[PDB]
């Protein structure tokens with residue numbers, strides 16, 4: 301028949317959508333909310349997960365609808381109200397709910413947000429429900445029609461067109477597909493691939509091994525990591541294929557001294573240690589103390605013992621660890637994350653233009669800090685998970701202009717050429733991984 305969501309399910313997505321605003325990446329929020337409200341059933345877990353990503357993906361469009369109905373941007377409203385309104389608008393417009401579900405929205409959702417806030421906000425929600433269910437979707441503008449096809453803001457659509465041209469439609473298709481796959485890396489230091497595959501297939505988990513990096517596995521969700529034997533023993537870590545390639549490209553050797561200039565939560569720095577076979581030294585810098593504690597949790601659980609974590613600004617060092625002291629440095633630079641809009645769909649709506657240039661300047665000063673850490677024979681790898689030239693090819697052309705003395709080491713495997721020859725790019729619509737950029741440099 302139709303879509304029937306139980307009361308605990310209604311409270312679940314509301315809390316997930318609310319927490320998704322303050323906990324990033326939003327997957328952690330979804331996990332937290334689902335365990336809080338006891339979503340044990342796989343069928344409910346699937347349905348609510350699908351709705352979760354549908355809301356994230358269409359957030360900006362949903363908000364425009366809320367503004368038409370309510371009269372103001374939902375951004376000035378209470379967080380629980382905003383979350384409830386987003387859930388209700390998405391369910392009413394897209395998911396054709398059964399009478400029981402609309403009843404649970406009316407009574408159980410109103411009550412839930414009241415208990416988290418004040419009776420008046422539940423009442424206000426209750427007063428809006430009928431307007432939402434009677435709302436006639438009306439895309440008038442050629443701009444509004446465009447935004448509804450790609451599920452993206454006009455500025456982003458325009459900016460992608462300037463980069464991909466004919467491929468723009470395919471790009472948005474690939475970041476719009478659903479799709480329930482999670483990418484993980486097998487910790488070779490503590491387990492082997494087939495053993496992990498078998499343990500996953502021992503559960504009801506569908507597994508597909510990556511052809512580009514055989515330690516990467518795609519698993520079909522939902523998958524509980526805090527009850528997983530493989531995860532709690534440190535055999536597996538969540539990482540995209542593109543991110544795994546980064547460490548392999550830099551190619552750190554056992555006994556070398558390596559720097560991960562922006563390291564937390566530690567997907568790549570933990571991978572660098574595998575390639576160095578738990579020998580040598582890794583200096584791991586990150587300004588975020590709360591992200592660094594995750595890296596420390598991963599390091600010891602995964603049996604890593606060569607990582608020295610440093611909660612400091614990465615523009616410092618030199619004169620923290622030394623000048624030309626690194627055999628090779630990885631700069632997986634803080635960035636816009638625009639290449640990850642398939643994985644974290646809501647980012648397409650939260651991104652600004654401004655701050656593309658703000659991130660671009662930070663990357664350059666980390667890049668200058670990286671340059672001075674590299675030994676004469678050493679190598680520097682610069683990566684972002686951004687698709688913008690401003691953060692990528694532009695930042696490398698600048699680097700090759702001011703430095704003296706680096707040169708670009710040509711890259712081919714396993715992805716495609718970037719817009720500067722010798723650089724490499726991954727694309728969602730070409731490679732089924734996140735948008736990514738690679739620049740390998742040596743003195």
Ligand SMILES: Nc1ncnc2c1ncn2[C@@H]1O[C@H](C[C@@H](N)CC[C@H](N)C(=O)O)[C@@H](O)[C@H]1O
Nearest residue numbers: 562563564565566567568586587588614632634
């Ligand atoms: N100036 C800075 N110094 C050190 N870390 C920074 C600085 N600016 C941003 N960061 C960190 O850069 C990180 C960006 C992430 N893309 C790093 C991911 C990491 N390389 C991984 O593979 O797990 C965030 O954790 C930021 O806290």
